[PDB]
Write a protein that binds this ligand. Structure first.
Ligand SMILES: Nc1ccn([C@@H]2O[C@H](COP(=O)(O)OP(=O)(O)OP(=O)(O)O)[C@@H](O)[C@H]2O)c(=O)n1
Ligand SMILES: Nc1ccn([C@@H]2O[C@H](COP(=O)(O)OP(=O)(O)OP(=O)(O)O)[C@@H](O)[C@H]2O)c(=O)n1
Ligand SMILES: O=C(O)C(=O)c1cn(-c2ccc(O)cc2)c2ccc(-c3ccccc3)cc12
Ligand SMILES: O=C(O)C(=O)c1cn(-c2ccc(O)cc2)c2ccc(-c3ccccc3)cc12
Ligand SMILES: [Ca+2]
Ligand SMILES: [Ca+2]
Lengths: 209, 214
């Protein structure tokens, strides 16, 4: 029915774009459609949803959802730090870029030997939240959900353990891993059907607390 | 009303994406909207339009336009080499990536090594040379695009004119009034801002004009 009534949820979706200069960047192919699906299903089940959106300009804003638009992985981090204290549930569906150019040209780049692009690591927003909650800075946080693309279960359970989040959605082959040792598989169906299985898992996790 | 009837037009639009692995890539912010609008305005005036499209702002295939979807700059070059002998008009509105990664992983990449790069071919320049070398007998108009600005190395117009001269195309459509239509005869025409549809009309009108002089 409306099991997420009154629940404050913060969702990230899409891929980030790390500028090389004002027009070029490093991007990824994540559509963010799956992240929009969870936000939509959450708003559909009563949650007060805020959505931070990356490279998703051609998607429809989900109904009833407060939209936050970002560009790079660092802008996403700032937006998460800004909105996370108000959330009871955080869903990190963005394909956040793992690295960024070490230098950003303030102008568009233009004849002999090609340059290489030095890289620097971007901050792990999901770990930083897991740490903030463990440091008592996120008293409202009842659920932190991560995503992973990957024996997948070997990599998946190891990644769930390293992130320290409450649930890991891997391949969304597709599985719902709980820190409780629960393993469920995600029947590869529609993005709506998988967004229902995730929120089913979230509402379920919230009740055990 | 149908001035491009019987004209075979080959159009490129959008930005290319140069893969590092299956999920990451190097791209640019090109929407493809002006390139699609020219393809649309060409087909509506009777042309047999083929549109080679890379990354766009989520644009819809125009009706009555033959679509070819490409990813990287090398795939765009191959697609243009394949279709150019049949085209009478080439409109290179795509932002073709000048470089691509030296190595592509077939799987994703879990300290980091920098990204080595290798240059991509200049697809528009190769078309100008092929026609000047007689390999494109049907090609009557070659059109390039440029987004230029004024900097410590020269005013926008200087950069724009230099780009027309180095490329050697018949027309250079320059954005920066919105921009310029520079012809290979030394003709220069401001591009008045309008919708992408209206500006596509001033462009095709310029192309039709050049084709009449040709
Ligand atoms: N800088 C980053 C990178 C990832 N994540 C989040 O952590 C999960 C990681 O996804 P994954 O693709 O596995 O990224 P990595 O943890 O870096 O793993 P790998 O590089 O091996 O793919 C996702 O929820 C993503 O939103 C994040 O918050 N900040
Ligand atoms: N590898 C490339 C690069 C550019 N172009 C084409 O050439 C025209 C001019 O693009 P532009 O990038 O403006 O020319 P460059 O010489 O790459 O510009 P710059 O030297 O300013 O970077 C465009 O129509 C584009 O489609 C191309 O065909 N192949
Ligand atoms: O030099 C040029 O004329 C030139 O176009 C480029 C130079 N870089 C570049 C070199 C080294 C580096 O560290 C950072 C950047 C480019 C990067 C990307 C693109 C591109 C990609 C996709 C679509 C369109 C354009 C084009 C260029
Ligand atoms: O079709 C589009 O709108 C698009 O994406 C464009 C990509 N380039 C482009 C960018 C860099 C480059 O090196 C090569 C090509 C453009 C250049 C000019 C214009 C344009 C021209 C006239 C009026 C309005 C816009 C539009 C594009
Ligand atoms: Ca990653
Ligand atoms: Ca260029």
């Amino acid at each position: 029915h409306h099991d997420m009534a009154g629940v404050k949820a913060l969702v990230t979706a899409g891929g980030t774009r790390e500028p090389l200069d004002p027009v070029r960047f490093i991007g990824n192919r994540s559509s963010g459609k799956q992240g929009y699906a969870v936000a939509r299903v959450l708003a559909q089940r009563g949650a007060d949803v805020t959505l931070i959106a990356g490279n998703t300009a051609g998607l429809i804003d989900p109904a009833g959802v407060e939209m936050v638009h970002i560009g790079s992985a660092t802008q996403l981090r700032d937006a998460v730090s800004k909105h996370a204290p108000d959330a009871n549930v955080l869903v990190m569906a963005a394909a956040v870029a793992d690295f960024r150019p070490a230098h950003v040209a303030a102008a568009k780049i233009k004849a002999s030997e090609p340059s290489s692009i030095d890289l620097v690591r971007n901050d792990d927003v999901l770990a930083g939240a897991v740490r903030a909650r463990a440091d008592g800075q996120l008293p409202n946080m009842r659920a932190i959900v991560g995503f992973a693309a990957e024996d997948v279960l070997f990599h998946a359970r190891a990644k769930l353990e390293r992130k320290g989040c409450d649930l890991l959605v891997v391949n969304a082959d597709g599985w719902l891993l709980s820190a409780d040792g629960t393993e469920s598989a995600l029947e590869h169906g529609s993005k709506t059907l998988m967004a229902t299985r995730i929120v089913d898992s979230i509402a379920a996790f919230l009740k055990s607390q």
